[PDB]
Amino acid sequence: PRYLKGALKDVVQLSLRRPSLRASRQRPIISLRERILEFNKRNITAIIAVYKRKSPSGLDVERDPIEYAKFMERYAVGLVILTEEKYFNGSYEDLRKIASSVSIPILMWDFIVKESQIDDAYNLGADTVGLIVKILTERELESLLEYARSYGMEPAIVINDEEDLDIALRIGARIIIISSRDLETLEINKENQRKLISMIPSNVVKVAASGISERNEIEELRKLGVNAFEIGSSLMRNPEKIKELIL
Numbered sequence: 001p002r003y004l005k006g007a008l009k010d011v012v013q014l015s016l017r018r019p020s021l022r023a024s025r026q027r028p029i030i031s032l033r034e035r036i037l038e039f040n041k042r043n044i045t046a047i048i049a050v051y052k053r054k055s056p057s058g059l060d061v062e063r064d065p066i067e068y069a070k071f072m073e074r075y076a077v078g079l080v081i082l083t084e085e086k087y088f089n090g091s092y093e094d095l096r097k098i099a100s101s102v103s104i105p106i107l108m109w110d111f112i113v114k115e116s117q118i119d120d121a122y123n124l125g126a127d128t129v130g131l132i133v134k135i136l137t138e139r140e141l142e143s144l145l146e147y148a149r150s151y152g153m154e155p156a157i158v159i160n161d162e163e164d165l166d167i168a169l170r171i172g173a174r175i176i177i178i179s180s181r182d183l184e185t186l187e188i189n190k191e192n193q194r195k196l197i198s199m200i201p202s203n204v205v206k207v208a209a210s211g212i213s214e215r216n217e218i219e220e221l222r223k224l225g226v227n228a229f230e231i232g233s234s235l236m237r238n239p240e241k242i243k244e245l246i247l
């Protein structure tokens with residue numbers, strides 16, 4: 001991993017020790033990237049709902065993962081499921097249960113630093129994973145990206161600054177998540193997010209993440225070329241808000 005400090009250093013060290021599991025995937029890879037493009041073709045708003053019990057940027061929400069996923073199956077373009085345990089109170093059990101239950105694309109959100117986490121995602125039924133430029137070297141990003149591709153996954157590459165974006169383009173990213181939330185400071189900077197969006201080539205699918213709460217925001221971002229919209233805490237507290245946001 002890169003040179004880190006504080007909680008990011010901690011989460012990375014914990015991820016390195018994350019026990020791997022054994023399971024048989026019994027699910028095709030269903031592409032998140034492709035379904036986003038299809039939603040764009042059909043002029044229907046593509047919202048990726050996040051399932052997360054805890055986060056550094058919210059109060060804890062205890063709710064049933066299956067009930068959540070099955071509700072979102074009707075409305076969301078895909079789901080992101082937290083499997084990081086210490087800071088997000090996720091588990092691979094949430095992923096297994098959700099993947100067995102729904103037929104929409106699933107992205108596993110964790111702090112991926114070793115190949116066995118990708119094995120875990122695959123074996124549990126996730127369609128793809130995020131890779132986080134903030135915590136990985138160029139070399140690690142290229143190796144993990146190729147490894148995920150060997151399972152037929154196309155990882156989303158997660159960025160929040162220019163240096164991160166340049167590395168995402170260097171590795172041949174095809175789908176990028178531009179998060180407005182800095183992982184270290186928890187600052188939301190939407191000016192910076194828009195600037196990053198403007199710099200992504202047109203053939204890369206662009207997902208805007210964090211700070212999205214209104215249909216008017218989604219409309220403005222779509223006009224700037226954003227393809228889909230990742231939304232977490234507000235849906236965790238009020239899942240049916242998604243019906244307003246897609247209207």
Ligand SMILES: Clc1cc(Cl)c2[nH]nnc2c1
Nearest residue numbers: 108109110130158179209
């Ligand atoms: Cl997989 C993943 C990872 C991080 Cl850090 C994210 N931040 N916002 N959306 C995300 C998805």
